[PDB]
Amino acid sequence: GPQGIAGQRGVVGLPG
Amino acid sequence: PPGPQGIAGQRGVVGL
Amino acid sequence: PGPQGIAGQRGVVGLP
DSSP states (O other): OOOBOOOOOOOOOOOO | OOOSOBOOOOOOOOOO | OOOOBOOOOOOOOOOO
């Protein structure tokens, strides 16, 4: 059988 | 069901 | 069942 739904979007990267 | 849900994403890369 | 979901996709980088 297939695998689970893809994980939640990760939080944005920082600037300087 | 397949899987429930994948693990949440971690942060993006920081500044330079 | 299925195994777990694919991991969450990381967020978007900053800048100089």
